[PDB]
Design a protein around this ligand. Structure first.
Ligand code: 2GO
Ligand code: BCL
Ligand code: CLA
Ligand code: CLA
Ligand code: CLA
Ligand SMILES: CC(C)CCCCCCCCCCCC(=O)OC[C@H](OC[C@H](C[N+](C)(C)C)C(=O)O)OC(=O)CCCCCCCCCCCC(C)C
Ligand SMILES: CNCCOP(=O)(O)O[C@H](COC(=O)CCCCCCCCCCCC(C)C)OC(=O)CCCCCCCCCCCC(C)C
Ligand SMILES: CNCCOP(=O)(O)O[C@H](COC(=O)CCCCCCCCCCCC(C)C)OC(=O)CCCCCCCCCCCC(C)C
Ligand SMILES: CC(C)CCCCCCCCCCCC(=O)OC[C@@H](OC(=O)CCCCCCCCCCCC(C)C)OP(=O)(O)OCCN
Ligand code: HEC
Ligand code: HEC
Ligand code: SF4
Ligand SMILES: [Ca+2]
Lengths: 35, 145, 193, 858, 35, 38, 35, 35
């Protein structure tokens, strides 16, 4: 069960990277047209 | 409205024997496999002693005609029971690995065209509906493992 | 994407093979390294790793256009066919990895529905070498250009199909992690092809 | 509102009742004539096709279609009938016929007779309300068939006519002075549910005494079969209760007899509910606006949608393994010349997805239609003074934004989870290097068997926990690489990818063993060494349906579960001890030791064979226990898969994604909060826009929200189609027999994208299906012409085209062409036909994924 | 029967769960206008 | 213009990017910290 | 020589029927929508 | 050289062809406006 604790850490970093990046392009697209 | 039925045509079947629909026979497993076993064995001898007089003699007429076109029966390359002959490299139909790695559609063209050196082509001997029946009979040879 | 590809494996030389002949292998017209510092090691190394019959082949050389390339007429000489494992491995893995992986998997255990699975012993035992040639040449199943197993009689040469036939017998009884290695081919050839 | 808009809106609500009633009665009669013809299309001389095949399992279950009947008939009723003028039956005479052809012809004729008469009686109510009509107005295409004009002035369906051309003599339901007749729609709900109860009773009497299926518990002790007269419990399926393809007696409610007992049950319930409503009809103020047929139309229609979704679900389960469908797999099924893999399941899949597709359309259209009632109310002033709480519960605009915004948040979270997991595991399966991280694939090496005696070169770390450790290659004392046998692999070990033959991962060099002696909970009965890379096998358990299913199955099967667990246990201990004996042989070092060792292994061997055969046969007994929710092709348990868990999450997220436009129709038909900040007010239900203001406004009307529902819903629907037909939905590139699927006994056809190419190689082998594929693709991309922001470009180019063609007419003296004006759709009609073309393209193409075969091998 | 009942119950449960969320939000944001 | 708070996310995305590349390329190159080797 | 002529006649008919049908769709579109 | 010149000339003749066509239409419909 260290593979399931290790795997889960990765999957969680994947979600922060991606969803953080998506809401990063939505915040930088607001500064280029309004702020 | 559209499909008023659906115009798909009439079904191709084998030869007619009087008083017993051939088209129907071609979808009824116990009838089609009785004709497949006759073709496979080259005789009417292994057919259920319950077979009618008219049936037993229609099969013989079918065989006699095929014997004049030099038709070679499947049994006895492959045996009456499967799983041929390692000598002749004749396929063992009892084997589960051989059965899993063949689709029935695929098997068809290997009987039609023949298969490499020895297994003969049957496209000029038999109808495509008689090959379909044989693919169904070969399916029932499978054993476990 | 670009530039930061890796280092090349020292075992894959780039030292050049002889060019593919212009003349057809089926021609009736007239038929069918140095001592410089490292040139001999490189030639000897190309002789094992770089494949010679990977390229699509002249159109008059394809098995359907070759007079001796039909399933009925091809020569499956077992002595020539299982002669050299280096060669079976060099050639059949390049051809297989290119043409056959898509549908039969990266492990060669079946990808496309109902596709063959070459590791299965029951399948191995019940196929001839000539049988395997027929199904490559004809395809399997009803359809235009072969069936779900496509025909190769335009596409491949008789010599290319024969490397494929010998390579495919190295799949026997292997596990489902990629393709047969050089020592799978060699144990296959020692146990009589 | 001058073009084509008045053609597909010519018959709008509200309408008088005689007009609704007669038109429905005529549709009923028409649908019975069409089914009549489908009975003719099912006789045994015809090819298989998709119409007669969707009817055959049911016709078998009813006993109308006999699967084992070959005897040809030559006389039956009236004397002497070889063949006649169209012959002995019209045109069916050149063919050989069996008894099941006669039954099929009988039922086909009845349908046609009762249909034609229902069409007539329906026209008597429909035209009869209007006082009557003429043969020329009824039929209307008889004016231009000169001659027949003297018999196209005759009036039919009149009020006082001689009996055979009467219509409605008191003009309308409301004038006719019969007291039994109910005067409102609430009141009428009661006789309607009595009438339906009676239709049930009719079906059960027909089942019992015309088809000879008595209801349980009055089933016969014996039945007639092709082998004579047999006890009911041993007679095979069409004739009796013994299922041949599962080889068990069927539950009594799994039989058509079970169905005739439910006919009487349901009928009694419906008749009693109707009797209750006869004394207590619905009455509350909450419901009396539903007397307007425009309002109840919304209720009824989206209700029927939900009924259709429920038919799909119930039908799927109830019949996925029923002997009606499996019986098709033995009937040598041939379509467009071919031979089909598993036509049973294919046909079953097509019926269930056809109901699924009807469900979505009618829910959406019911909501759309309800939005039309509510827009009407707003635009005439009376929305603000509606009295039923079913309207007023949702009037507050701030509640409307809270409802919608939290269903967007719920959609967002669950779609991000689903799709994000699909992406993670296609990264894993493809071993992609991102530089910032390397994804790694599942790989398994058998550790018992004879395969556990294969050697590998192993790079072994010393201490993974000291960073700055390093490792070494396992060696001999002699210096050469030791070959470690698979049985002695330990956790931490690295093996070169190219010693394993792997060419698909060129970006990393080694497989790591992460778990030894692994036996799949559900899978193959072996022991393995595994690289779990990034593949998240735990994700199967993140499914509430995994757990309900496995718990209920464990409870029903507890003690074979338990013995199978004890067998595994004894086996693992025998493997381990036999591995130590083999190792002492390998390292024995002196023939005295080597004989002693080989003699110990030789003495333990029988006992290790016993433990293996014991484990094998308990694991085979466990894998043949009956299914609960996740099933085999032979109604046996399977554990839930990553596939099933992804499908759970995608149903939540994707149906909410697809249904948020419907909530926008229900709340925002007149004003959304973006409109209300500007003071805007939507003036009609179908306007295209009002923009370029505020950046642009295309797509705010209710008609457009309906179209966006239809598109967004394509995504959960295709999840449903891939899952029914066996694709793997939890990744994008799963291969059929990849190591993971093989070790865990999973059968699938492809993996998102790979499924597409995998099934189409089967589709290419049929030339009728490849023609359908070509036409389907063309219908779709043309929708883009109609949906892109481009209508002005198309209008201004069409205009250049018209000028040019008129110039050619004038120059060449061709009078038909000197006033050509090409018609160019406006924006509203472009959006309508663009949605039509998009939808039909996609779903002809999906029919093909079902039509190709069901290739899941179980 | 058990499978049919489980599947139907899960569909109605998804509806009921959405109703409960959407009503945990309404009940506890009643002092705030959405806008 | 960029907020303090949006600069402190762009910092968490970079810490996850060099915890991933530090454990991916270090054992390949240095032959240490064997736990993360592939 | 004769196969070729026969084939040209089928292809002509196909062009007459498909282009002909397409223009009829336009005319019909025109009559509905307006004149 | 031969294939290069042929291709190039075939593209240049594609443009020259079109202009000629257009020139024929303009000259032979002088005095018909296209309204
Ligand atoms: C070898 C495969 C073969 C070739 C010849 C081919 C090529 C192409 C091309 C091209 C130029 O290469 C194009 C442009 C093209 C176009 C199309 N094809 Zn196409 N196409 C093929 C075959 C087929 C077939 C049989 C089918 C399509 C189908 C379709 C359709 C699809 C229309 C569409 O918009 O469909 C949306 C739905 C999709 C893409 C399916 C997604 C499935 C998935 C399992 C759902 C769940 C998982 C996701 C991550 C879900 C999101 C979560 C949530 C919101 C649900 C159109 C006409 C179509 C289809 O996908 O419809 C849903 C279809 O059924 N096609 N297709
Ligand atoms: C069962 C109850 C009926 C129904 C009966 C009525 C009656 C009576 C009235 C309305 C009215 C309305 N309904 Mg309604 N309506 C139904 C479903 C819907 C759905 C929907 C998504 O399914 C929507 C969006 C609407 C929307 C509407 C509006 C157009 C209208 C007034 C606003 C509103 O109420 O918001 C509705 C918003 C929702 C969020 C509700 C959605 C949930 C529904 C209730 C049930 C879904 C579950 C279903 C049972 C699951 C099936 C089980 C499986 C198949 C196994 N109804 C179902 C079929 N409805 C009023 C009207 O005036 O129109 C003419 C009205 O008087
Ligand atoms: C999933 C994403 C993905 C991954 C993991 C890779 C991986 C790679 N790409 Mg591919 N590439 C991708 C997507 C990806 N690509 C996309 C979307 C495109 C379309 C624009 C390309 C187009 C492409 C080309 C044209 C090339 C590659 C190349 C490469 C390789 C060198 C990468 C490199 O230098 O990076 C360092 C890159 C950066 C630091 C960004 C600059 C590497 C195998 C090269 C190669 O040869 O492959 C074998 C190469 O020539 N890439
Ligand atoms: C290239 C065009 C093409 C052709 C030549 C065919 C021909 C055929 N279709 Mg396909 N079909 C097509 C396109 C085509 N279809 C398209 C675009 C769809 C989607 C609407 C379909 C949907 C389809 C279905 C669902 C079925 C067929 C069937 C048939 C067969 C009988 C047809 C018939 O009765 O017509 C006469 C009927 C009419 C003219 C309309 C009534 C025949 C092999 C049937 C079959 O089973 O074949 C295997 C069948 O069930 N057709
Ligand atoms: C099948 C695809 C298709 C076809 C044939 C056309 C045709 C045309 N488009 Mg549309 N368009 C399409 C798809 C298509 N488009 C798509 C996918 C988009 C999204 C970008 C658009 C967006 C669009 C815009 C914005 C505009 C057009 C315009 C044009 C016209 C250009 C004027 C001209 O060049 O005359 C030459 C005519 C041809 C070159 C085509 C000949 C007829 C073709 C080949 C075949 C008929 C095929 C049809 C599918 C057959 C079904 C017939 C039935 C009997 C079966 C032309 C009528 C312009 C226009 O002027 O408007 C009127 C225009 O402004 N197109
Ligand atoms: C284009 C983009 C928008 C998308 C790209 C997504 C691709 C990356 C997504 C995942 C990134 C994960 C970050 C890396 C990470 O933390 O995972 C590795 C983690 O180990 C952390 C250590 C860091 N020490 C402590 C060494 C500095 C490391 O990786 O080096 O645990 C795992 O390694 C998980 C192992 C999996 C199974 C066991
Ligand atoms: C070839 N192998 C695939 C099938 O293998 P096997 O039969 O072993 O397993 C399944 C699993 O069980 C379910 O999969 C039940 C649904 C769970 C709901 C999970 C929870 C649902 C909640 C969703 C609520 C959404 C609301 C809030 C908008 O086979 C099936 O039952 C699938 C066939 C049914 C077809 C899908 C029916 C439509 C889907 C739901 C429609 C919803 C609409 C009413 C909107
Ligand atoms: C006042 N003007 C604007 C306001 O009015 P407004 O826009 O509603 O007017 C339309 C617009 O113009 C078109 O919309 C273009 C059609 C021509 C393109 C022509 C291109 C069509 C070919 C497309 C085929 C591609 C598919 C097969 C993929 O109103 C309509 O056309 C309404 C659509 C009704 C059409 C009914 C078609 C049925 C005819 C079938 C039988 C005919 C023949 C077989 C005899
Ligand atoms: C990648 C790209 C960017 C690079 C482009 C490559 C350019 C190469 C140029 C192509 C050079 C061809 C010459 C070789 C050749 O033609 O061979 C012999 C040819 O002899 C000649 O006529 C010689 C005269 C050549 C003087 C022409 C100069 C070309 C100008 C280039 C302009 C480019 C523009 C501005 C777009 O033989 P034959 O046709 O007689 O016989 C048939 C051969 N079986
Ligand atoms: C590239 C050249 C190759 C080689 C060497 C082979 N294949 Fe395939 N294959 C496919 C399918 C669906 C089957 C099953 C056919 C059936 O039973 O229905 C096969 C089968 C084979 C066999 C076995 C033949 C035999 O008779 O037993 C052999 C030797 C074979 N294949 C070799 C599918 C496909 C493909 C999908 C389109 C492609 C591409 C290939 N195959 C390619 C090759
Ligand atoms: C020997 C003379 C044969 C007679 C008569 C029949 N078959 Fe055969 N067959 C024979 C051999 C030597 C082989 C091996 C083929 C090879 O691989 O080299 C076979 C093969 C088959 C197979 C398997 C085909 C496959 O694709 O995998 C089938 C289904 C088969 N044969 C059927 C068959 C039938 C139905 C025959 C009589 C109608 C028949 N065979 C005759 C040898 C011979
Ligand atoms: S492009 Fe079309 S939809 Fe958009 S604002 Fe203009 S007219 Fe309206
Ligand atoms: Ca399928």
């Amino acid at each position: 069960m260290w593979n399931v604790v290790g795997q889960i850490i990765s999957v969680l970093c994947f979600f922060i990277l991606t969803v953080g990046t998506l809401f990063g392009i939505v915040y930088v697209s607001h500064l280029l047209s309004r702020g | 409205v559209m499909a008023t039925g659906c115009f798909v045509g009439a079904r191709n079947a084998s030869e007619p024997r009087l008083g017993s629909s051939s088209i129907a026979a071609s979808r009824t497993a116990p009838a089609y496999l009785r004709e497949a076993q006759v073709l496979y064995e080259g005789s009417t001898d292994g057919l259920p002693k319950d077979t009618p007089a008219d049936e037993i003699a229609h099969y013989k007429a079918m065989l006699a005609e095929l014997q004049t076109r030099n038709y070679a029966a499947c049994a006895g390359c492959h045996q009456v029971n499967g799983g041929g002959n390692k000598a002749i490299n004749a396929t063992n139909f009892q084997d589960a690995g051989w059965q899993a790695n063949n689709s029935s559609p695929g098997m068809v063209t290997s009987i039609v065209n023949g298969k490499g050196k020895v297994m003969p082509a049957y496209k000029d001997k038999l109808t495509l509906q008689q090959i379909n029946y044989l693919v169904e009979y070969i399916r029932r040879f499978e054993k476990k493992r | 994407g670009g530039c930061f590809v890796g280092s090349r494996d020292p075992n894959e030389t780039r030292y050049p093979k002889a060019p593919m002949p212009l003349q057809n292998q089926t021609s009736t017209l007239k038929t069918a390294a140095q001592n410089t510092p490292g040139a001999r090691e490189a030639a000897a190394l190309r002789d094992r790793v770089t494949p010679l019959n990977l390229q699509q082949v002249n159109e008059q050389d394809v098995a359907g256009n070759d007079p001796l390339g039909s399933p009925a007429r091809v020569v499956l000489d077992e002595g020539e066919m299982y002669r050299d494992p280096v060669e079976i491995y060099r050639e059949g893995r390049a051809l297989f990895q290119n043409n056959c992986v898509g549908c039969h998997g990266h492990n060669g255990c079946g990808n496309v529905p109902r596709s063959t699975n070459f590791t299965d012993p029951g399948w191995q035992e019940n196929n001839s070498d000539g049988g395997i040639y027929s199904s490559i040449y004809n395809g399997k199943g009803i359809g235009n250009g072969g069936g779900a197993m496509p025909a190769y009689y335009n596409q491949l040469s008789p010599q290319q199909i024969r490397y494929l036939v010998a390579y495919l017998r190295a799949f026997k009884g292997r596990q489902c992690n990629g393709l047969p290695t050089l020592s799978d081919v060699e144990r296959m050839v020692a146990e009589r092809q | 509102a001058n073009g084509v808009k008045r053609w597909y809106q010519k018959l709008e609500l509200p309408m008088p009742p005689e007009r609704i009633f007669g038109a429905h009665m005529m549709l009923i009669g028409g649908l019975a004539c069409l089914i009549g013809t489908y009975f003719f299309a099912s006789m045994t001389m015809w090819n298989d096709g998709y119409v007669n095949l969707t009817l055959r399992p049911r016709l078998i279950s009813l006993g109308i279609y006999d699967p084992y009947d070959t005897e040809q008939i030559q006389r039956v009723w009236l004397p002497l009938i070889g063949e006649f003028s169209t012959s002995k039956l019209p045109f069916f005479g050149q063919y050989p016929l069996t008894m099941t052809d006669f039954r099929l012809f009988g039922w086909g004729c009845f349908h046609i007779g009762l249909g034609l008469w229902l069409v007539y009686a329906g026209a008597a109510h429909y035209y009869g309300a209007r006082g009557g009509a003429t043969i020329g107005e009824i039929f209307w295409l008889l004016p231009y068939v000169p001659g027949l004009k003297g018999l196209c002035q005759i009036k039919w369906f009149t009020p006082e006519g001689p009996w055979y051309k009467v219509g409605l003599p008191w003009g309308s339901f409301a004038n006719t002075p019969w007291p039994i007749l109910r005067r409102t729609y609430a009141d009428a709900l009661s006789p309607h549910t009595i009438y339906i109860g009676l239709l049930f009773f009719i079906w059960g009497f027909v089942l019992w005494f015309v088809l000879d299926k008595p209801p349980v518990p009055l089933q016969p002790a014996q039945v007639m079969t092709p082998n004579g007269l047999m006890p009911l419990e041993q007679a095979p399926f069409p004739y009796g209760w013994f299922d041949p393809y599962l080889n068990q007696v069927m539950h009594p409610m799994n039989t058509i007899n079970g169905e005739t007992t439910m006919c009487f049950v349901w009928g009694v319930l419906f008749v009693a509910l109707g009797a209750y409503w006869w004394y207590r009809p619905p009455r509350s103020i909450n419901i009396t606006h539903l007397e307007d047929t425009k309002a109840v139309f919304h209720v009824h229609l989206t209700a029927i949608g939900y009924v259709s979704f429920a038919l799909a679900i119930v039908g799927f389960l109830a019949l996925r393994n029923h002997p009606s469908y499996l019986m098709l797999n033995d009937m040598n099924v041939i379509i467009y010349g071919k031979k089909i893999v598993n036509p049973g399941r294919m046909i079953h899949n097509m019926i269930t997805f056809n109901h699924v597709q009807v469900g979505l359309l009618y829910v959406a259209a019911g909501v759309f239609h309800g939005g039309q009632y509510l827009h009407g109310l707003n635009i005439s002033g009376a929305y603000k003074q509606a009295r039923s709480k079913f309207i007023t519960w949702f009037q507050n605009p701030d509640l409307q934004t809270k409802i919608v915004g939290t269903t967007m948040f719920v959609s967002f979270v669950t779609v991000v989870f689903g799709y994000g997991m699909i992406c993670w595991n296609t990264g894993a399966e493809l071993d992609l290097n991102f530089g910032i991280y390397q994804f790694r694939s599942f790989r398994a090496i058998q550790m018992d068997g004879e395969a556990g005696n294969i050697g590998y070169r192993v790079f072994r770390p010393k201490n993974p926990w000291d960073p700055t450790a390093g490792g070494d290659w396992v060696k001999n004392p002699d210096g050469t690489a030791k070959l470690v046998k698979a049985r002695n692999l330990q956790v931490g070990d690295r093996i070169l990818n190219e010693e394993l033959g792997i060419g698909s991962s060129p970006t990393y060099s080694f497989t790591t063993i992460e778990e030894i002696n692994y036996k799949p909970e559900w899978g193959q009965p072996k022991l393995y060494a595994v690289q779990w890379g990034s593949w998240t096998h735990f994700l199967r358990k993140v499914n509430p349906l995994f757990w309900v299913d496995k718990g209920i199955w464990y409870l029903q099967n507890q003690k074979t579960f338990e013995a199978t667990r004890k067998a595994d246990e004894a086996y693992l201990a025998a493997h381990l001890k036999a591995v130590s004996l083999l190792n002492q042989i390998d390292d024995a070092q002196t023939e005295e030791a080597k004989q002693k060792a080989q003699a110990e292994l030789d003495k333990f061997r029988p006992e290790l064979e016993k433990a293996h055969a014991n484990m094998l046969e308990w694991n085979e007994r466990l894998a043949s226990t009956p299914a609960v929710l996740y099933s085999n092709l032979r109604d046996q348990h399977r554990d839930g898969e990553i596939n099933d868990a992804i499908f759970f999450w995608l149903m939540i997220g994707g149906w909410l994604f697809g249904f948020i436009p419907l909530l926008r129709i229900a709340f925002h038909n007149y004003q959304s909060p973006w409109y209300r900040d500007f003071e805007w007010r939507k003036q009609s239900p179908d306007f295209p826009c009002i923009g370029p203001v505020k950046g642009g406004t295309c797509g705010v009307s209710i008609q457009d929200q309906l179209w966006f529902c239809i598109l967004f819903s394509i995504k959960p629907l295709s999840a449903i189609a891939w899952y029914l037909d066996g694709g793997w939905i939890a990744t994008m590139m799963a291969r059929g027999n990849e190591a993971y699927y093989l070790t865990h006994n999973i059968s699938h056809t492809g993996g998102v994208f790979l499924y597409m190419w995998n099934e189409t190689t089967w589709i290419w082998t049929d030339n009728h299906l490849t023609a359908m594929l070509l036409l389907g693709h063309l219908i779709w991309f043309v929708s883009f012409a109609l949906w892109f922001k481009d209508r002005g470009s198309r209008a201004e180019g069409g205009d250049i085209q018209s000028r040019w063609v008129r110039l050619m007419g004038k120059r060449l003296g061709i009078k038909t062409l000197q006033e050509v004006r090409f018609p160019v759709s406006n924006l509203a009609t472009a959006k309508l036909w663009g949605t039509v073309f998009f939808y039909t393209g996609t779903f002809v193409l999906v029919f093909l994924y079902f039509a190709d075969g069901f290739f899941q091998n179980r | 029967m058990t499978a049919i009942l489980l599947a139907c119950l899960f569909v109605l449960g998804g509806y009921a769960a959405l109703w409960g969320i959407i009503k945990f939000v309404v009940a506890n944001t009643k002092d705030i206008a959405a806008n | 213009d960029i907020s303090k708070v949006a600069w402190a996310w762009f910092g968490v995305l970079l810490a996850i990017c060099l915890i991933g590349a530090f454990g991916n390329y270090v054992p390949k190159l240095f032959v240490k910290m064997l736990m993360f080797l592939n």
